[PDB]
Amino acid sequence: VTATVNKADKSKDRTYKTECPLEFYDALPRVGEICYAYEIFLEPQFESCEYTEHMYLNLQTPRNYAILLRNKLPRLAEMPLFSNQGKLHVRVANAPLEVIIQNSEQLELLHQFHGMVFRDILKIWHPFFVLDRRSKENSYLVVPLILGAGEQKCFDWELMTNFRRLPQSHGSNVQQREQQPAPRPEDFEGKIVTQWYANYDKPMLVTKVHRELTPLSYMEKNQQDKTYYEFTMSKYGNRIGDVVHKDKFMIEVRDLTEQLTFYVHNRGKFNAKSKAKMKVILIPELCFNFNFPGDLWLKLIFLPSILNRMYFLLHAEALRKRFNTYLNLHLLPFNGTDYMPRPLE
Amino acid sequence: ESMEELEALRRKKFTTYWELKEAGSVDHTGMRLCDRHNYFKNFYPTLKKEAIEAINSDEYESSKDKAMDVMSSLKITPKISEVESSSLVPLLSVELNCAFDVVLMAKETDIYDHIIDYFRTMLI
Numbered sequence A: 001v002t003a004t005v006n007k008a009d010k011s012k013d014r015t016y017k018t019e020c021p022l023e024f025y026d027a028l029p030r031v032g033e034i035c036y037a038y039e040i041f042l043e044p045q046f047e048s049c050e051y052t053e054h055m056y057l058n059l060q061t062p063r064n065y066a067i068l069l070r071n072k073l074p075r076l077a078e079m080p081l082f083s084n085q086g087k088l089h090v091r092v093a094n095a096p097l098e099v100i101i102q103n104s105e106q107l108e109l110l111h112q113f114h115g116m117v118f119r120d121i122l123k124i125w126h127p128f129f130v131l132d133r134r135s136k137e138n139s140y141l142v143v144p145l146i147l148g149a150g151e152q153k154c155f156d157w158e159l160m161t162n163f164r165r166l167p168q169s170h171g172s173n174v175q176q177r178e179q180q181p182a183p184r185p186e187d188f189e190g191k192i193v194t195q196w197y198a199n200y201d202k203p204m205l206v207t208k209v210h211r212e213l214t215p216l217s218y219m220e221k222n223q224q225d226k227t228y229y230e231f232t233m234s235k236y237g238n239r240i241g242d243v244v245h246k247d248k249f250m251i252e253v254r255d256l257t258e259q260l261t262f263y264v265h266n267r268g269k270f271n272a273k274s275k276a277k278m279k280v281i282l283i284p285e286l287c288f289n290f291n292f293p294g295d296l297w298l299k300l301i302f303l304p305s306i307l308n309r310m311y312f313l314l315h316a317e318a319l320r321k322r323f324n325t326y327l328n329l330h331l332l333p334f335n336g337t338d339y340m341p342r343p344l345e
Numbered sequence B: 001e002s003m004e005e006l007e008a009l010r011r012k013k014f015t016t017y018w019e020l021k022e023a024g025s026v027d028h029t030g031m032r033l034c035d036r037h038n039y040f041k042n043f044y045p046t047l048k049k050e051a052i053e054a055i056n057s058d059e060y061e062s063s064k065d066k067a068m069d070v071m072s073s074l075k076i077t078p079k080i081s082e083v084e085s086s087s088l089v090p091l092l093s094v095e096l097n098c099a100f101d102v103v104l105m106a107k108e109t110d111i112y113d114h115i116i117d118y119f120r121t122m123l124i
Helices: A053-059 A104-121 A157-162 A174-179 A226-242 A272-277 A296-299 A303-328 B003-022 B035-041 B045-054 B063-073 B108-122
Strands: A036-046 A064-069 A079-082 A087-092 A097-098 A141-147 A153-155 A189-194 A206-208 A250-255 A279-281 A287-293 B078-083 B090-096 B102-108
Touching: A036 A141, A053 A206, A053 A296, A064 A296, A079 A303, A097 B108, A104 A157, A104 A226, A141 A157, A153 B063, A157 A287, A174 A226, A189 A296, A189 B003, A287 A296, A287 B090, B045 B063, B045 B108, B063 B108, B090 B108, B102 B108
Parallel strands: none
Antiparallel strands: A036 A064, A036 A087, A036 A097, A064 A141, A079 A087, A141 A153, A189 A206, A189 A287, A206 A250, A250 A279, B078 B090, B090 B102
């Protein structure tokens, strides 16, 4: 304290080694061991409207995912998030789902799906990213969850084995169009699609199919004297080559935001009426179809923010328990096993 | 023509030479450097009106999409390459390949909005 050595470097900073919460250390599920799954629920606060239905109804879908650990999680508080449509509420299941891993290949399938989500769906991937099995720090897993018999919920095995990697979209030519089977309205309903002709290869969620609307029909607005087919040719004739399956059904699709960090309330003049009036109509065989359902994609999009917030809430819980035990106040009903977390203010 | 041919023929030859040497750096806009910035202003209204309508449109899905649509509107071809850098986030440069030698560069999270700002400023 009396030394003059550190008087000059007053406003410097220091580097520190971060450490995961104890729950997220050695959390990699193991064969022959009991593992716990915590379903993550999301509740939209904003009203469902022409600017918001595709997010509201999709979030309220019963299909969800869960976090899988060897280490039991404590109770966690309700969590707010801010999407473009409005404020969003997130919670973690207080009652873990418990299953047993029995063979290596099932764990490999789980880990493959976990890697695929970040590599393709979120595009958090880097060239130097490698999957880890050391069961060292930050080794928890993510598993999609599908409703089981009755009220029970179970793992979506077919989804994981079907999507070890996302299929690359490709531009089929006219002969490829002819040899391919006709599009089916049910195979598109609720699925993720992307356009393989234009530079816009980014995915989108089709809200619903329009089986009653076919090419040569006049459009919605402005160019009401023009038809879908003629505009598609005039726009991208040199890209598409030609159109096959002329008389088939059309679809109406809405876009998926690229944001990942929804902590802070993004604000602006969203012009909901005009943003709804730009009703995007696309030709099915002109846009590649993923079998991946959007009711899981619009919830996987929020995964990074939730994971980071949980990463820090676990440290907050650890500190709270340490202090309440140190002061000998832990035996109180306020701080005991009946500890009820309160939503973040 | 005696002096005119001596000028035009070597113009063609040297312009082709520089175009094959560098793919850019060839100035054939015909405008004085004191006023070469008026290049984007002096296009036909056909491209300009629709380009400014696109760049003024707020419904666009993303800044990248807006940039690509505006650039395609002026029929100007893109050219994006990765410049070497010490930054973890890649440092990307964009070349427009038009007669006016123009190049822009930033982080790839900002290159599209940078193109938005550039074409917003120039197109009037």
